[PDB]
Amino acid sequence: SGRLWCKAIFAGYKRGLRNQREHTALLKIEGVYARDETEFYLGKRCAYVYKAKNNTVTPGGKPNKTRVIWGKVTRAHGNSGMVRAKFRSNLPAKAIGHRIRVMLYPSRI
């Protein structure tokens, strides 16, 4: 009846100063701001949910406008709770600073 995922922001790609690696995304999960605090989310899978023009099939429902790219948190990134993620398709650059769902169910509690 309510939300079941954590909110994250797609901050950018894994990059040096002048080189971009599009196969690894950077997520900023809201609330966590520490390396020792970001351990809980390792291995959790994440979704990028967007809407397009024409209908697509929907598992367990009728076709609608929504589509998803599925990925997974790989490991932490820096001292400020930034995490790295790998999506099965590299994220489009129009998703910078947009909401990414981090699910709970790949759980190890």
Place this chain on the structure above:
Amino acid sequence: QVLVLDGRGHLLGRLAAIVAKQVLLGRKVVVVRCEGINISGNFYRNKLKYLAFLRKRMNTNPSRGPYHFRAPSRIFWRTVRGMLPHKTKRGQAALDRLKVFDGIPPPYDKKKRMVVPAALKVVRLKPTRKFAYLGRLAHEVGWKYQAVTATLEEKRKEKAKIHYRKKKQLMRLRKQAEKNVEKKISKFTDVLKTHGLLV
């Protein structure tokens, strides 16, 4: 979802540093009352700096050259613009989702204004160091609305004081209320206390 910041007592660049990254990350930031932003260093230094910036001008056609905005809100906005990548469309979107005001307009005078201690003068400056006020600097470099903003701000202050006194009377009534009805609510105060919600 809208982050409303108060500008009084902050340091210009050190606050713009926070705001720029926050806006790049998609938040809608509204910085309010920018005439109270402070800058480290004494006033004569700061106005010489701004006058050198004023002298910066395109020799062939000044109307094409750098634009020297005089309002304090516009000075802060241009600082954030310099910290953002404004030549790209992502930076332009960030600029669009940032908004800055002088004084406190009616859209936001009825909202709780936050504060950023990381960019706060009392925290980041030794007490013996001198500083300056952005409102005074803007007025002395050309701003034409220091007095009107002052009168509107004081009006807002009496209205806010009326509201605050009403709030205080209401909450004193509430505390009188709870110490009136503690006997009937005693079965819940203990279950709050045992989990640390009270006291």
Place this chain on the structure above:
Amino acid sequence: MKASGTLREYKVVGRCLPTPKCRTPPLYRMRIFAPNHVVAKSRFWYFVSQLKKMKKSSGEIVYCGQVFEKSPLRVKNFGIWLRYDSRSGTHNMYREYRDLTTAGAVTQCYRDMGARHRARAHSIQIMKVEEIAASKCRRPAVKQFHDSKIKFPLPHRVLRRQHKPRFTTKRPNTFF
């Protein structure tokens, strides 16, 4: 030498190799403050080469061991005689410090000299360090702590941890 981290006190002993001229040369010991025993032995060879007619190849280290302080829980005043190379000429200097350990006092001296004269641990040449009785100290910055009923408040407590509640709604308090 690089004054990495907290220094340590090392007793280093050494002597020339036995030659047909003399069956056994005299032993020489020295107090050396260094991050570890490798640099301690390096500094021993440096100093003993400076003083006597000895070299790494013609001598040998006999015992290199850390020296622990005999009272690490009582505060002491240390007087330090040293020698450093400025941009123009070299100078002898006497300094006062106040802490628990001799190695701590020496590393504090290194930090102080770097901060105040821009001298560097390779230019600084420590020669003497002695624990000084409280009545023989000469510098006011350490003598003013020789008050049995010492008393002072903490006037202006600057806020730290200013990024954990990054966007707070309270103006921080500085008086406690």
Place this chain on the structure above:
Amino acid sequence: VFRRFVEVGRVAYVSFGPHAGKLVAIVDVIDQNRALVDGPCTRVRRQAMPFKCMQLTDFILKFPHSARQKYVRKAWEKADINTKWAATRWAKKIEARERKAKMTDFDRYKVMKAKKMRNRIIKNEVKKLQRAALLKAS
């Protein structure tokens, strides 16, 4: 005006670091920003601590500036600091925060269901008081 001073014998709460959340007693002052400290009755060895990791409390127990852990301890138990600290409101809200962080799913459900009715009763009787103010104004 200041009320809390750093002299020999004052006890102080340790906010961050290894020995965080424990009381200590100032034994001596080394320099401008470091003190020789020892908490004998609270599992803290005698050592040096910066003043910026300590925050003073309004308790003073009296002993000489170079006394041993034996005498610091005897002062501690005869001044029974361990009970006065728990009686103070400072430690009460410390343990309140600790309990609130300790809550689980079920007991936070209980808290929600309890404060729901508590707030209902308070709000109703406040409305009653407001209309009482209106009627006596009339």
Place this chain on the structure above:
Amino acid sequence: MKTILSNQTVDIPENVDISLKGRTVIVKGPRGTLRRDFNHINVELSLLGKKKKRLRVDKWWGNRKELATVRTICSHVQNMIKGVTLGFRYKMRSVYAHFPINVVIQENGSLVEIRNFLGEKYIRRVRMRPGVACSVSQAQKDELVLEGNDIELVSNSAALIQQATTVKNKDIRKFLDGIYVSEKGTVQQA
């Protein structure tokens, strides 16, 4: 080096009283009352002794340049007390060689008209800072007398008129005309 403590006290005479509102000092005595704010100097002000005998200013952990400011506060408070219990009187002499300097006082002692200075014809106005009264002396040939409660305002106004009567583009070593502060004292000479 940082000095642990630097303190200094000032005694308070009995007829006058002092009240402290933070770092603002309010002093009330027979001649009136006056207030000074010290929120720019960052010290500790205590008002100790029952029947309010001593004011103690002290600073903790200060270096040279602002442990030098401790005695400045004591001197200001002493000048303040002296003003409120005795008042300040600045006696100024008008000196000239050939042209008599004409001084006329108006607005009840708050404005000074200077005429015929060095034989000029431009009439020089000076307006006296509030709470300071200028009077023409008696039993003296060319003297102004300045009456006030605050040494700051009295001396500032005296300097105003002194540097208003100034000689330009000539040898001031020989053109020794103008009005200069001859003596600085009190109203009630106790």
Place this chain on the structure above:
RNA sequence: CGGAGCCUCGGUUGGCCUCGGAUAGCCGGUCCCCCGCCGGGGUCCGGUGCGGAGAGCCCUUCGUCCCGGGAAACGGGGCGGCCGGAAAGGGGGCCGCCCUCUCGCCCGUCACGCACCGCACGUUCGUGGGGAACCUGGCGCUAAACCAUUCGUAGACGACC
């Protein structure tokens, strides 16, 4: 002002409705006291690593069905009037209304529901913005601008009077 749908653009997945400020000091009451149009000051009482705490507060939604306790009764919900706003104007409070419920909230009793057979974009803001039409109704409205012509306070041509 008063219905079903269609196409297109997307983002989002509970709200915080506000003192002013100081920082070598603050906050909250009280008024015994003093002034002013309830406000300011004085005394006193309490908090201050802030608990009248943004480390915070509010709302918290599986639904229905019987009966009991607690809480409510002055309450819930739905029509006429009074005020509340200008810096970029308040879907708020109050007074009556014809009506209806002992239902809403907390503990219990009672059973019931597509129990879709381990599996993903689920759960909103949202009658969202925009564009076309099908529409049943009511209240109303039947304008200008430009060209052509004329003018010369204007003018290369446009423009302008």
Place this chain on the structure above:
RNA sequence: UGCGAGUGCCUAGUGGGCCACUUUUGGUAAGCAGAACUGGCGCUGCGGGAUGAACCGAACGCCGGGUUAAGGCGCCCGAU
């Protein structure tokens, strides 16, 4: 200590060089002219020095994961 060596034919291009640490001649000096040793650029991309032939690191088949060099970690811009 390390390593498989010896040997014969035919042979293209080249025969304008330039730079840097230490040595060094002329010259007041030069992004000047002339030498010695070693390494580079020319013939060479890549990380850092904002920008750059020769500077610091490191030399290159097409890729996934991990870790580093020099240089860095307020925002632009990855990292206190």
